[PDB]
Amino acid sequence: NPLFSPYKMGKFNLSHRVVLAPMTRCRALNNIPQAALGEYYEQRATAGGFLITEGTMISPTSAGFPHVPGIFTKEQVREWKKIVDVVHAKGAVIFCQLWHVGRASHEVYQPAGAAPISSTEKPISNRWRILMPDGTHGIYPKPRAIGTYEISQVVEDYRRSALNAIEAGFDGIEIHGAHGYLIDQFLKDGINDRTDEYGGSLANRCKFITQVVQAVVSAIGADRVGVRVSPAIDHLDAMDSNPLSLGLAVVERLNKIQLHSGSKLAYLHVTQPRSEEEEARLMRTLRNAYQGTFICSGGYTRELGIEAVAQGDADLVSYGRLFISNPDLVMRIKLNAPLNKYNAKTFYTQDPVVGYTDYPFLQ
Numbered sequence: 001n002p003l004f005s006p007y008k009m010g011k012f013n014l015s016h017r018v019v020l021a022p023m024t025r026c027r028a029l030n031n032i033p034q035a036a037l038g039e040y041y042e043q044r045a046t047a048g049g050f051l052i053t054e055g056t057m058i059s060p061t062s063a064g065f066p067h068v069p070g071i072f073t074k075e076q077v078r079e080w081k082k083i084v085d086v087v088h089a090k091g092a093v094i095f096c097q098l099w100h101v102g103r104a105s106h107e108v109y110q111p112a113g114a115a116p117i118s119s120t121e122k123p124i125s126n127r128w129r130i131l132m133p134d135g136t137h138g139i140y141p142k143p144r145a146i147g148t149y150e151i152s153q154v155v156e157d158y159r160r161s162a163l164n165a166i167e168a169g170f171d172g173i174e175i176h177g178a179h180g181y182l183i184d185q186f187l188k189d190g191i192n193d194r195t196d197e198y199g200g201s202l203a204n205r206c207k208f209i210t211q212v213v214q215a216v217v218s219a220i221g222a223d224r225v226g227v228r229v230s231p232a233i234d235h236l237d238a239m240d241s242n243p244l245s246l247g248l249a250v251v252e253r254l255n256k257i258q259l260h261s262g263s264k265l266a267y268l269h270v271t272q273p274r275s276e277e278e279e280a281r282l283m284r285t286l287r288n289a290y291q292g293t294f295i296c297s298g299g300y301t302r303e304l305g306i307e308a309v310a311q312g313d314a315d316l317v318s319y320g321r322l323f324i325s326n327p328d329l330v331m332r333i334k335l336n337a338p339l340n341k342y343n344a345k346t347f348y349t350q351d352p353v354v355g356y357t358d359y360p361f362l363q
């Protein structure tokens, strides 16, 4: 089984290729990591396995979901350290995903009820609705388009959060540059309508992600930095007129950052939509273009994960929903044991146990 051949992720010796995909679960009450998160990640951790946390806020303005953890306060760092410790006690490697939602927020999530920030002043359309703290769905508001000073300060928030992640003991961080959130609002020409140096050309649209990656690379080293993008996913009105060219432009800049810094990133992580042959060809095109480790994600199964590694399409495969309902997903994939179904109703609830840590292990 190629998913259980060892893999050298730069500094990190992995024993298998089954990765926990980053997943917002909303149990980090008041943006503070809680004991429940420790139980949840420990349940899923394996010796030599790689885990990526839920998206974690880099600043007071970066959230668009209830009760997501941050890593911008000293209190959050102290609580994260307890979770990293129980994961390292199992011999796993764990990265913290740094997440800014940009315009995908609401006054209820913003300090002083201020408008969310973005590349643009245009709202997400009412084709999409935001999960509210009371479990209803609300309307995305008009964001505020930020200037280049403010852009530089958001980059500094990524830099400081990366340093905080290292202080909590994380092995590294992942830049969330996917799914129509802040970075993707700069990348995608369906969102970025700017006429300054961060808008227009493909090069201009890639400037923000380039500066974010350069900042965290300079702070903690490239081998502790992963980057996640989704050029072909149109979530929250995040379409681009040429997804493959956009993805190749990002990949070229990642390659150049590595050559200039003299070190490889931990990995590039791409999520695909689930045309099937065309989507697979676009993922392989990005993989072939990138000088380093490639993590594929989106709709993978045991069979599709085995094929991806066996055919050279990816080095690692991340699993989201199947890891929600199978704490021992790695062992089940190893044994080809039947997998248990997941319950979407408890993906984003606040209960520390129900639908979070009470999915059973194999008997």
Ligand SMILES: Cc1cc2nc3c(=O)[nH]c(=O)nc-3n(C[C@H](O)[C@H](O)[C@H](O)COP(=O)(O)O)c2cc1C
Pocket (backbone or CB within 6 Å): 021, 022, 023, 024, 025, 054, 055, 097, 099, 176, 178, 228, 271, 297, 298, 299, 300, 318, 319, 320, 321, 322, 347, 348
């Ligand atoms: C409930 C839930 C929360 C998620 N939260 C995040 C997140 O915070 N950051 C992120 O990059 N992806 C997030 N994702 C996307 C997953 O990382 C992953 O790409 C997707 O679930 C993989 O597809 P799969 O579920 O079929 O394995 C989330 C997915 C789900 C279902």
